[PDB]
Every structure is written in C-alpha cells, then in structure tokens.
C-alpha cells in the first residue's frame, strides 16, 4: 500500500493512494495542496524526488523524518490544483 499524506487548501491533513502503474504518479487533487509525506510498503521513505516538478520546499519537508509544524509553510509553496506529480523513489 503506497500512499501520501498531504494538506489541502484549508490546512487539513488527508491521505491519498498512489497508482503504481507505469511508475509512481499522483493527480486529481482538485484543490491546492502541499505534499507532506510518502509511504511505500506501509513504511516511510526518504530521498525521493520529482523528475518533472521542481519544488525544493516539498522535498525538504518530505525528506525530514521528525515532526513538523504547519505554521511555518506559507500559501506560496502550495502547488496548483489538478497537478500531475511523478515520484522517483530509490531502491
């Protein structure tokens, strides 16, 4: 079970599954979102990156393992809705 934890526009934590066909990709959020964490095989992974989307803040948030505070990230870093994001997980 591969799934991502992300916050919507209203700063609410939600979980969405990942489609593993022809790679790892996510789409159809329907709202501005900021990806928080990625889980592959019911475990937390680090060192992931996007091969088509350039965004340092989400990479920095994902790669850190400790608990984070949602009061430090502004609305600027939020990605636009209906965005196709691909994952490159090391293995």
Keyword list:
mainly beta; 9% helix; virus; 27% strand; two-stranded antiparallel sheet; bacteriophage; phiCjT23; 1 helix; four-stranded antiparallel sheet
Structural class: mainly beta
- Please compute the radius of gyration using only Cα atoms: 12 Å
* Number of DSSP-assigned strands: 6
Helical amount: under 10%
Order of helices and strands: EEEEEHE
Strand content range? 25-35%
Please describe what this structure looks like.
The chain is mainly beta. It has one domain (3-87). The protein contains one helix and six strands, in the order βββββαβ. It has one helix spanning 56-63, and strands at residues 3-7, 13-17, 24-26, 34-40, 43-44, 85-87. A four-stranded antiparallel β-sheet has the order 2-1-4-5. The chain has a two-stranded antiparallel sheet with strand order 3-6. Strand 4 (34-40) and strand 5 (43-44) form a beta hairpin. The longest helix has 8 residues, at 56-63.
Q: In brief, what are we looking at here?
A:
By secondary structure, the protein is mainly beta. The chain has one helix and six strands.
Please render the helix and strand layout as text:
Elements: E1 3-7, E2 13-17, E3 24-26, E4 34-40, E5 43-44, H1 56-63, E6 85-87
Antiparallel strand pairs: 1-2, 1-4, 3-6, 4-5
């Amino acid at each position: 079970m591969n799934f991502i934890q992300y916050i919507d526009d209203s700063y609410a934590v939600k979980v969405k599954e990942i489609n593993s066909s022809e790679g790892f990709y996510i789409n159809g959020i329907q709202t501005p979102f900021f990806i928080l964490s990625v889980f592959i095989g019911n475990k937390r992974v680090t060192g992931v990156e996007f091969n088509n989307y350039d965004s340092l803040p989400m990479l920095s948030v994902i790669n850190d393992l400790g608990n984070i505070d949602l009061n430090v990230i502004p609305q600027n870093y939020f990605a636009t809705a209906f965005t196709e994001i691909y994952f490159n997980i090391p293995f």
